[PDB]
Amino acid sequence: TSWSDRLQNAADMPANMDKHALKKYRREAYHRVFVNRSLAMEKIKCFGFDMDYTLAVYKSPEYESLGFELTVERLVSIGYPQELLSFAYDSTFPTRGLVFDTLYGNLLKVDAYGNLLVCAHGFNFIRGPETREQYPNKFIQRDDTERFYILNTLFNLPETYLLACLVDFFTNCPRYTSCETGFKDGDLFMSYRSMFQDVRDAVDWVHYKGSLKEKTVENLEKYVVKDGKLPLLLSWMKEVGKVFLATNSDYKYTDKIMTYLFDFPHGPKPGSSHRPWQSYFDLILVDARKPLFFGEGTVLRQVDTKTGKLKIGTYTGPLQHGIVYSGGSSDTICDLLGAKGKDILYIGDHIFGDILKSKKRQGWRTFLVIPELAQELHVWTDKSSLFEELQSLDIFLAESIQRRIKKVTHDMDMCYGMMGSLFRSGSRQTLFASQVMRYADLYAASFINLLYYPFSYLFRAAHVLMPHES
Amino acid sequence: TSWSDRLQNAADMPANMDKHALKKYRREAYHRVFVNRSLAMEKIKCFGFDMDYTLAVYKSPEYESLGFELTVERLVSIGYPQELLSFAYDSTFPTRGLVFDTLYGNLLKVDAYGNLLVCAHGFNFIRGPETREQYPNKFIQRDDTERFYILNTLFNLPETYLLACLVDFFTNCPRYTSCETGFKDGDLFMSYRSMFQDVRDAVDWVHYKGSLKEKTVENLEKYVVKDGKLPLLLSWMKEVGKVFLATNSDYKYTDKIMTYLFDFPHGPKPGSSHRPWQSYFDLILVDARKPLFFGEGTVLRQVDTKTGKLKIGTYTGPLQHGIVYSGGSSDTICDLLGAKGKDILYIGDHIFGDILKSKKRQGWRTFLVIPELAQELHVWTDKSSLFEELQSLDIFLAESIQRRIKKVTHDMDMCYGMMGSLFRSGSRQTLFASQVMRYADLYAASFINLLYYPFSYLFRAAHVLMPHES
Amino acid sequence: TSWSDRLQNAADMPANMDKHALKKYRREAYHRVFVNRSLAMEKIKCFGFDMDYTLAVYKSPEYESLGFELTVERLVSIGYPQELLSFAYDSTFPTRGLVFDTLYGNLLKVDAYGNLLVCAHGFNFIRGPETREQYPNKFIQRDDTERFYILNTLFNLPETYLLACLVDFFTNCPRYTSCETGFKDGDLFMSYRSMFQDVRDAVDWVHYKGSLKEKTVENLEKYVVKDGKLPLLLSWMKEVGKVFLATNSDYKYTDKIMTYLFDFPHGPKPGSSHRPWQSYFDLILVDARKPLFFGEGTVLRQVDTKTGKLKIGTYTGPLQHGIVYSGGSSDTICDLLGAKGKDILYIGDHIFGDILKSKKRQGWRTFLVIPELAQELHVWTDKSSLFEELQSLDIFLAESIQRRIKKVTHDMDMCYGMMGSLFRSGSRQTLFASQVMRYADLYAASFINLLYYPFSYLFRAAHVLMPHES
Amino acid sequence: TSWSDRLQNAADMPANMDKHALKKYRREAYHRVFVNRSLAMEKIKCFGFDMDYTLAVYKSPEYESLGFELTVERLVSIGYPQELLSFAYDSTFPTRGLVFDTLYGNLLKVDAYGNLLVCAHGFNFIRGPETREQYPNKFIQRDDTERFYILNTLFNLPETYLLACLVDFFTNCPRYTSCETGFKDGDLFMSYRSMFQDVRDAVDWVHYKGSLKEKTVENLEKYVVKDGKLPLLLSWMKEVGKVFLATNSDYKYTDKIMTYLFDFPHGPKPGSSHRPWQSYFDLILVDARKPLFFGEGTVLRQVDTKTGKLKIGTYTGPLQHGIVYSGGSSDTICDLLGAKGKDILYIGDHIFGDILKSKKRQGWRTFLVIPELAQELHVWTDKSSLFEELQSLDIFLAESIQRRIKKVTHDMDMCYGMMGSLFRSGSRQTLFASQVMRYADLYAASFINLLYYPFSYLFRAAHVLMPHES
């Protein structure tokens, strides 16, 4: 069972709008909203959304596998070897947020300070001592962006696996000689950096010029979670405030996906007239180019919604009914909706490009969707005894049996996958976890979990104290 | 008769290799090589070439008209008005080297110091006094590259005309209101800058993603000058030194064009066996990315000439027979051919990207091909009396009748086209002329003119003296 | 009683080296080391130091007042009005870590997310509603470094006060007209930005070209804390590992200050022979240019310790006894001492330039000295009932009397000074507090507090859990 | 006899204002204005000046020798060896416009294309073949500004000589080992780059913080050319147009120098009342920070001329009598004087910082003062037979005795000095010559030569023709 299986199972449930019944849904950790900083929902006047992996949650592992297959096919078409066609996506390998080291060709899981938690070269997991040869301080400088690329989006899951497949393939194929920074094929030398760049370019190509969008929209039932509670929640938001869409996607793709998401024989609730998806938004903006959107942005354009093309010129007119915007900036949204940053709850999955930047640059309130949480929670609670044991062992130090710490850390981590939990390795939190705590005011497996809280709800987190204050 | 008609007429002539006969060809100014700095041909050990508009001279106005049509069609496809489809390319308007002012939407012909010689807004030629409102010092800062774009390649001729067509169209169409920096269409404002960017992007699109290459290669006889003397000259070069190709074009396009250029029922001379185009080069490099090529370049790759794809990896091996390179840098060429810069004569049409940069960055010797010269010479000699008269009038000043200077300047210029000579307006030299004198050691309407000089020839220019030395 | 009075009082105490007695010193919160992340002291092989406000703690408010006076005198000498000479430093105004807004001339205390906690224009504290006119979202973008300057060093305390004095003076002097971004004096307009730049330049001038160093070294007893336990602790460090100095100061100043710090009629303990300060260090590096030191650094030079001048050339030789280095980089230290980053405990006061950068760029362990903590602890414990009351009030919300929250927040804050605690305003933590927690592994009012812990000590912090893990 | 001896000799001559007599002064090449582009003096409405080496011509070799001595003393004070004190400035070595190669420690004289004309390592002149080892193509990339520094100001003459002295000293002193990129002194390595940087910093120090200004103003008769015709010419300029000063120097230095330049017992002509120097200018601007002045500039300030300090604030008021400006931009001058660029003749010695930039960025007309011309003309005419012979030899080629070309080139060049003419080596023009021709509309040994032409004069240069036009 994947995380999207959980989401789709919860999606198939009709709501019961009884206040006591919605409150009781928050028994299950799966339906909760989690709180890093306090947020009085009564002060939120605008709810903003990203589309991909937020409103449109792509089913796993099917969508990752499609991306993988198309990326492989593109690499083969530009001259990579035919053996790539025998690879098959394996959802049990990648965890999101890994760092590809382009110098040595390793995937690294790191903490918020760049300390190594896991190091794999292809499919070989390198133990601590062997790691010191390449990482003498078991540390990387993660802002050396020429060397390290952080794979922190769900769209990066197929390339996370593909990088490891490629390193493994070239290492074990006798045509190539393994060197410390790449592979030698006679008078050709393929550095891990060049290989990585080829992969990154191919993933981009598949999204922008290849068939990924076309294949997705041909079979939306296969590729996209659909939930009758989406229209209901968005309708309740629009009763208390304004609702907006700000997506990097183009209008044509957005319209196909959103039409599908709202394709039920009813509107917000069963028995109600169906309403077009656009009627749920006070403001619709596509081609947003986030993160640049949260600084200078690009010029504000208007979409000709009959053709899907942009009208010629910068749009200088007012917010009007039926208009669709393209480009612009986060200030556009504030100005057109008459909002200040703290009046906005922005709902998205991109912990950097959206959540971090909207928070740091604009002081927006933030809700982070983490699709994997649906499955990470099941593992966390199910294997709570292992972590409890780890926490007991860490305590038990009067000042060997640190290999029991390593064993239990290994067994815990393997329950999540080969690269472990998104949030930790044993007792050490990942960079991704630290970024979630720092920049996501609220988070959950789905934003639909807001359905289970009233709009006057006060989401509370404990006041933080420094060590000398404690 | 276009400049390419002249080139093709001279192309149809079989050579007579009699030394006296080849020397007598240099009667006609049309067959001469012109000299800005002295060059002892005996010291040249390597001859290097660009392909486009150098080896492969595209026929005019047919190729410009094709580019124009495809660019228009692309703009219409992205949402420009259908009326664009009624435009038709007019070769009598554009002269190469004009500056588009993106603030005010004017085409400007300027001297080497940025002084205005000609200013047109659409198809309205603005007289001197009216020019002062927008250009108070009749001057532009040409290195303000955010505002001014210099249209100095032959590929820029269609967009030169298209910019003027667009300014004219929007000015005279009652749907739009003319403003000083663009056009208002209700709540849309299209700046001249945005319009220019759309045009530039569309020209790029047509070359890289559209059908321009496909349409060219479907009818090479229509679009490309072919000359049996090309193989002959290149064969003579290879007897005295090394020959190389360094082109921005890709291998597949290069191979189609070059195959056509050498498709005769013979090799260098009639009666000789035909030889493949690649046999004429000691070194073949495609995807050169000039001008970057003359600094750091890009990594050296090898072309798989069976597939037209790049082999995977950086190429680390030696110069070998049959290899085709991709990317690299000008140092690659020097190293692989064992040459120093002054041993190289580099032959090309791009007065900036190639000739200027190879000279300034590497000290290569330079030969500039200027296709328009074939027709500019006919006008210069034919209307020599007008210039003579202008030169007499300038002299005749004891220290009105400056309007006779303006009249004669106008009539002279109109013989060349609406934007005048590539090289001057009346007695004032253009920026393009100044750049040719400064960076092209030799220049001519075609590099084939080298056929008429022996390889021991000493091309001589007079020693330059400062005014106080004279 | 200032924070340096506390430090000097604790400095006058002779140590009792009895293990039970040193352990009992850590009763008092004042003598503790506080722990943000666990640190096994047994793994530290190198102890590194900054000098200023770390080894050499300047007495307060005397040193701030000297800096203030000299800065004022410099501004007057370059043409500011004579009335500046009537200002007198007031230690009750500035708190460290404030942000000067150069657009509107305000001092701001902000949280880690840029939310406004306190806003003063000159000496006028602006209440919440009035703050919205200039800060509509009660938020600033703190990385807009062209607009906002963060005053986070102890050397910035005099200019913090001077900025407020200047804004107040120009506002209330009838020669000038107050505008929203500065002051008008007829045909002169002095923006807050220009004024700020003048102040910043004058503070720099006083440190680098003026008399601050000379006046300090003429009366070290007045200006610098001296503690017989310093040599003792450094001697114990050198028994278990290596000790180094890396200071931005020059050799001549360093030697004067360090000579004073070790000028007792004994060495590490009473009865022992006095030893020169240099004998306490395995490596001495001056002119470090931190933070650049933690990236590329500058070339490694050697100090001629007889003249205080640099020897000519880059130093290419080995670590040798008696050598003093200048410039270099953090890698120099690692290489010369044979250390990896995690083997180093770097001890300093500069929460950005040293502690943050050594941690992020190199993975060094960090100990932050916070001189004000000595007094902030006395206030925190003494007025613990007020905070307790605030914490109770925050709890008491069933979901007015938020003005009791504002009242109690005000009274709590005023016990620290006019700009409140370095660490918080009421229940909200400051940016400075957040940076301390994030980047300082350990912190204390003085590094001398390490004297009270054995070198095998395991400093422990609780494992952090995400909200969904709790 | 130095060039300043010539200038001072011509300075001692009283004018005879008889029109026939002033015209006859232009017999002598020494009193002419030379013309690169035509300039109708009748259209010039504003005359602008730099001060140093333009109005205030420093006497040679005395001023160079003072700069040299103070620069040496500064290097010794920061730790260079005492032997530097035995160096003595030698005016027969340096020619202006040489390039210091910081990689190999050579002084190079180059043409406009970076071709090597002369190469000296210390005082060893390297012949052609030996030059190829370090310069394989006898070429440098002169815009590699990290490697090459062009010594093109008269203030650079002392450091030109000092660089050669230092290279010579370290090469021949047995304490140091000569390496290809610097010198080894045990465990110290002094690169030519570091040495160059020390020299450059010391020259800057001497001008900005040392005693050069103080020593100059203590003995102005020794150090500065004074000419009673200066006030006369400036008075005639002010009758036909506006006059301005735009200098990088500060007000205090400017006032000392300018007071001296106008200290005669009369005003413009003998018998007239003396008038203060400021009365000769419609606009006085100091601290100009050229070349930045010709782009964005700095904020406009006003000088308090009683104190020599800046008034506080940006100056927002109008041009008024008696005001002195500081900073600003070239637009300030245009706006305040109501001028367009082509109405301005800007008179200066800095062929880059002023003449090039005012021309390229603003389209100002330009007059370049070249103090050395006064002596270069005497050599050019005196040894005209040698150049004539060189020109004959170059001609005499039917297509050995190229060593006669080298011999005659050597003997010609040696008449100017060890590094030859500022303008050429034999038949090859220098970079400096090419820049003069390209950017100086007019040039002369002194701007005082304008006294010999009426203000209606039409300065004429021949129309330039391309080779194909000839």
Residue numbers in the entry:
A (entry chain A), B (entry chain A), C (entry chain A), D (entry chain A): 3 to 401, 418 to 488
Q: What does the primary publication say about this deposited structure?
A:
Cytosolic purine 5´-nucleotidase (cN-II; EC 3.1.3.5) dephosphorylates purine nucleotide monophosphates with canonical activity towards inosine monophosphate (IMP). The cN-II protein assembles into functional homotetramers, with each subunit comprising 561 amino acid residues. The cN-II structure possesses the overall fold characteristic of the haloacid dehalogenase superfamily: an α/β Rossmann-like “core domain” and a smaller “cap domain. Whole-exome sequencing studies have recently revealed that somatic missense mutations in the gene encoding cN-II (NT5C2) are associated with relapsed acute lymphoblastic leukemia (ALL).
In this study, we describe the biochemical and structural behavior of the three most common mutants: R367Q, R238W, and L375F. Crystals of all three cN-II mutants belonged to the I222 space group with one molecule per asymmetric unit. Overall, the spatial arrangements of the mutants were almost identical to that of the wild type. We found structural differences between wild type and the R238W mutant mainly in residues 397–405. This segment was unstructured in the R238W mutant but adopted a helical arrangement in the wild-type protein. The helical structure was stabilized by its interactions with residues 474–480 of the adjacent subunit, and these contacts were found only in the wild-type structure. In addition, in the R238W mutant, the W238 side chain mutant was reoriented to avoid steric hindrance with F473, inducing changes within the interhelical loop at the N-terminal region (amino acid residues 3–30). Overall, the R238W mutation causes local changes, mainly at the oligomeric interface of cN-II. On the other hand, the R238W and L375F mutations stimulated catalytic activity in synergy with ATP binding and caused a decrease in protein thermostability.
